[PDB]
Design a protein around this ligand. Structure first.
Ligand SMILES: O=C(CP(=O)(O)O)O[C@@H]1[C@@H](OP(=O)(O)O)[C@H](OP(=O)(O)O)[C@H](OP(=O)(O)O)[C@H](OP(=O)(O)O)[C@H]1OP(=O)(O)O
Ligand SMILES: Nc1ncnc2c1ncn2[C@@H]1O[C@H](COP(=O)(O)OP(=O)(O)NP(=O)(O)O)[C@@H](O)[C@H]1O
Ligand SMILES: [Mg+2]
Ligand SMILES: [Mg+2]
Ligand SMILES: [Mg+2]
Ligand SMILES: [Mg+2]
Length: 325
């Protein structure tokens, strides 16, 4: 019989252009059949009724029942490409930074302010005009304030008096904008936040996309922290700049991929002070608008599948050579 690769995610994701491009390519593997789980089934049917697969590619996004995906994997025991339990932790920035620290990965100096919604002022924060103190730890402006939920993209940056004060409020892109300036100089007074040192970059963020630990595509984009106008090309796509990762950064990608057990993994790097700091780990993420990535990603995932399962299915398989970039 064919090896079945099951795709389990919200329709918005499973039906996206990158997914469709990759799935048609994986389907070219002679011994692999692709089955995309319908959203109505994922949301409404018990896991006992979900289709069978031998290899499961499943990932959480807004609205996805991760509890069900976990239960399905427990029931059927398929080969899992992106670890499901780690996807709970990826939703919590505190858990993400904790794992990065444990792996010896450079990240901005940070402190967590956990606030009890019942006693919002009993928390360990002291505010000055040009600094905050979080559990005793001082952060001079400029500093970054992030919601503990990784799914809340309302990240704020606070500027020093020497720069005009105020704050930059970041958010999920709306049309042509990704952030806006506010005259507000005081930090948010409700919610729990991570406070971290602002890393001076050249004005771009490096986005890294892994396919297993030995492949990473990188590209750069204007930092939303800069002014908030999104740069677009003549076709309306966000402008992307070429990046090649150095040896240190290739090791970062290897470490992130394995530490979070996400074969397909996106994360963000800040090139600052001669080093590269991880500021965000997003989990499952494809490169968009790159035919070469489509080819490479599909080939690598197909090969991972065959490597793991070909012996079980008595299929001859000789492990092939793959790109790293
Ligand atoms: O903003 C956009 C619109 P686009 O810029 O014109 O594509 O697309 C964004 C998606 O928004 P939704 O289209 O509503 O799902 C978002 O999904 P979410 O987190 O569930 O909101 C992520 O996509 P993914 O799941 O990781 O692949 C972002 O990638 P990231 O995690 O590296 O930041 C995308 O940004 P990038 O495309 O510019 O890289
Ligand atoms: N410590 C820092 N120093 C300097 N810039 C930062 C820092 N942290 C975040 N930024 C900038 O602010 C942006 C948003 O922060 P990030 O932690 O990526 O939030 P997010 O909401 O998870 N974005 P996404 O990549 O869509 O999930 C980053 O792309 C950086 O440009
Ligand atoms: Mg096939
Ligand atoms: Mg980010
Ligand atoms: Mg993120
Ligand atoms: Mg995501």
């Amino acid at each position: 019989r064919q090896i079945v690769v099951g795709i389990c995610s919200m329709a918005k994701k499973s039906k996206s252009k990158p997914m469709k491009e990759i799935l048609e390519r994986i389907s070219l593997f002679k011994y692999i059949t692709v089955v995309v789980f319908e959203e109505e089934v994922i949301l409404n049917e018990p896991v006992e009724n979900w289709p069978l697969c031998d290899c499961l590619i499943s990932f959480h996004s807004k609205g996805f029942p991760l509890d069900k995906a976990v239960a399905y994997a427990k029931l059927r025991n398929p080969f899992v490409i992106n670890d499901l339990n780690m996807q709970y932790l990826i939703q919590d920035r505190r858990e993400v930074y904790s794992i990065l620290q444990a792996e010896g990965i450079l990240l901005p100096r940070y402190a967590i302010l956990n606030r009890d919604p019942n006693n919002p002022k009993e928390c360990n924060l002291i505010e000055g005009e040009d600094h905050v103190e979080v559990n005793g730890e001082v952060f001079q402006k400029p500093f970054v304030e992030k919601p503990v939920s990784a799914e809340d993209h309302n990240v704020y940056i606070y500027y020093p008096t020497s720069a005009g004060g105020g704050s930059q409020r970041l958010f999920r892109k709306i049309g042509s904008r990704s952030s806006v300036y506010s005259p507000e100089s005081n930090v948010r007074k409700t919610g729990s936040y991570i406070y971290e040192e602002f890393m001076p970059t050249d004005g771009t963020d490096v986005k890294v996309y892994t396919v297993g630990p030995d492949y990473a595509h990188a590209e750069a984009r204007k930092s939303p922290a800069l002014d908030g106008k999104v740069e677009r090309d003549s076709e309306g796509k966000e402008v992307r700049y070429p990046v090649i990762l150095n040896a240190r950064e290739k090791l970062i990608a290897w470490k992130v991929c394995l530490a979070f057990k996400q074969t397909v993994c996106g994360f963000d790097l800040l090139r600052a002070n001669g080093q590269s700091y991880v500021c965000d780990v997003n989990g499952f993420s494809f490169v968009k608008n790159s035919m070469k990535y489509y080819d490479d990603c599909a080939k690598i995932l197909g090969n991972i599948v065959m490597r793991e399962l070909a012996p079980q299915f008595h299929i001859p398989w000789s492990i092939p050579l793959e790109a790293e970039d």
